Write a protein that binds this DNA or RNA. Sequence first.
RNA 1: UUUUUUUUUU
RNA 2: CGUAGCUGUAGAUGAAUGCUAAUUAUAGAGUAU
RNA 3: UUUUUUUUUUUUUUU
RNA 4: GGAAGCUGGAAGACGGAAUCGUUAUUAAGCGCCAGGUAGUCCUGGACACUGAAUCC
Lengths: 119, 162, 83, 26, 399
Amino acid sequence: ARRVGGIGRRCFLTLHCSACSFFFQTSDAIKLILTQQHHILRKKGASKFSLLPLADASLLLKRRGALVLRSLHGDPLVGSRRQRGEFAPQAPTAEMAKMLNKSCVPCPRCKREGRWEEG
Amino acid sequence: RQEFFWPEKARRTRVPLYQNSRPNLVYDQRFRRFMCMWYANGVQVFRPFSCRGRLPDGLGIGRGSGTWERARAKAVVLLKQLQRQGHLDRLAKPDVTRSGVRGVYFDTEEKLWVATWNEHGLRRFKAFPTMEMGFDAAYQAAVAVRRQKLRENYIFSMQRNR
Amino acid sequence: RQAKKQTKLAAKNARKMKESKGLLLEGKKTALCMNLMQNTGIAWYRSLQVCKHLEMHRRAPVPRVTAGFREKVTQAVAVVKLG
Amino acid sequence: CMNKKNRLALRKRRRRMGERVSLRYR
Amino acid sequence: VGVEDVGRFRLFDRHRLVELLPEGLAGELSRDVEMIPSATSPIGVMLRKATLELQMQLELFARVHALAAVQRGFLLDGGKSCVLNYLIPWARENNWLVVYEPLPSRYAREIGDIKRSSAGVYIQSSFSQEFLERLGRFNRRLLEELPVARRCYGQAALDGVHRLYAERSYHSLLEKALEKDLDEIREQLDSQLREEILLARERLALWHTYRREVSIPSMKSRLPNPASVWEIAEFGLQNEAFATQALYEVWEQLKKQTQLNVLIAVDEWNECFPVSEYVSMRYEGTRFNGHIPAFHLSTPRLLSRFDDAQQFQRGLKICATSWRRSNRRDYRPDLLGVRQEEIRTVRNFSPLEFANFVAYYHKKKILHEFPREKLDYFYMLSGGNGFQARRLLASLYGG
RNA sequence: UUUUUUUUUU
RNA sequence: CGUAGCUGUAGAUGAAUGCUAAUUAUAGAGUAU
RNA sequence: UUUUUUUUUUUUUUU
RNA sequence: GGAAGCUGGAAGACGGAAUCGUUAUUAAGCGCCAGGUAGUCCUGGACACUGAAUCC
């Protein structure tokens, strides 16, 4: 009756991976990149090192950490009231996939380079 | 007990109550409850049976079993109690309305016997006349149409005290 | 009419008297999660968060009171209350 | 979307797009 | 019995059926038996064509053991659970050790206890005792007579995990301990080849000793020398610790030796993979919203492995899924363990079988009046489905 | 109102 | 598409949704608790 | 369709 | 200005009296957008489904 995805079992918030078998929503994407900041910084080679404190695992679960994650995630599904009819929101995975692949973030399952894809 | 409540937020059904072959039996689809109809003194009274969910591990019969078949099993056992004991079986001396049975009304522009009834959204009119058959033969035929048509579609009509 | 505000004010003061305990385990409902919601500053959200660290069923009846059990429950409440 | 009719529509619409929003009150 | 007798009902004694099936009826048959007003009436089960093909395979399998016979389980997909009410009682009457479990999910959606461990498998002390207690109701007089092998004594952990697999969880902890302790020998060039090799040789000597002293598995010291498999009464006595170790010991014991034919039937197997009603902190961000997967528990995992059917040298397993507890949808059969050549896809009841079902209810005084004129009319309404036929005829007078 | 997969369990 | 059918929970005596240390979006600018 | 499916329905259109 | 998380002991089970009217795909419910040239309403305009009864 009240299933998630509608009649066609839509899924406009998940991204598939070419390697292994593991998918996650865009909500967990923000936390994954922030946690694995040491690997990204060393890959390329103070103002640059500004998000170092956010790498803490316990800080994210605190009141301050909860607000930081929500600030970056703008909830693209929500929009203006006039966006009705043909002007409906589409899957925002196109932008997320580009950043996740360019940043060269390892997958939790298996340590690999950019292997993410839209799905 | 004789109140036909209609919940605001609910699916409307064309046939809320389903008529069965047994006289003292009726199935309610609105609340998926089983009820029995009998005349008592003068009014229609029912015994609603719960069908919602919540024990021995031998067999799933009786006791606390929250199954849709529990209501059916509780109704058959109760029906025989009235007939065997003969507590209340007696004919409905309670009348329906002025125009005989419910749904039949006299015509105002001339002498006619109208019997309106819905069937798959359609309806009928005209029915049989009254001047060409008197006030006795025409009246008898008017009631015979409603009872005959209700046995096919399995439509149950609630009788009002007034 | 106006006396009701002062009369109901005693109920708020009664909560302070019931305080000084790690958690009011006693409740009205059978479910531990539902009873835990009686405390101030906890609702349907925070009620489930506390039970996450307990490693028990959602509708788990409250077990027997133990001295060592209170310490674990009290410690989890502070972490959840931080937000 | 001020009343409970129009406001609840937004939450139900997002539920069909592959998201889970709490429902509960309002 | 035979191809000529298809779609007929076989009478069963009320008292005999209870003894043969102490747990209960197979499937939702309990909802249809309570409708009969007569208490002394027998119970009938239709003999579908799907049972004839399956029954013949079992006959040849028994005669061989006295590579032609099948050595793997089947799967019923699509009235799949209706055959269980006739295949289990018949097999039990032929001196077959049948494991009955029509409601395996009861140990995953009820009040219980969970204790996290290093192995990563949650245990249920409360539900572990009920598994053996219910199995011994009718399978007694045979387990005690069966001997016990000596090659599988005590190599299982408390949570039923093997010794080899359990000790692997501590590999990370021991890896860092040895790295810090290597400074004693590292600090005392010689040919640049032998000096490095000699240092590495010390790691092998220390690793071998470290893998046999730190770990102290419990080798069921409560029973030094067993004599049988049913004489394990200490498992029922202690429940806080010895609840899961004994459960897996019997499971492994029934693969190696071959003395009697066995059989396992797990109904409603489509509700073991989905998430359970439990709550924990093992979620992968938003995959479970803080819930324990059903397949991650102890009892559900024991009955969630079809690829291991090859080790069953005595018998085989079987499962079926027909209820509406979850939408089947695609229901991939290749990524589960079964093959495309072992799936029995049944179809709707034929018109011939439909007539018999209606007539069967008449003898039970279920219906009031069912004229033959409308017999074929009702076939199109419900479409001949068993679930839609019993419900439609129950609500109305029928016919 | 919520499904498995790239493999290290006799 | 919504009340679906179907099917789990508590066959609610306790489901009222406004108040706010706090963020989401449009806009050049909608700020302070 | 006995190696076939694995399922609710809208306000213009197969000219 | 719109929506959302968390938190929640704002004032209500009063009255079967009385005033606003419906000529049946009427009445009663529920769901969607077109324009108002950035956002910006519980009214107005406009489409679709379930859809009972009476002596009018």
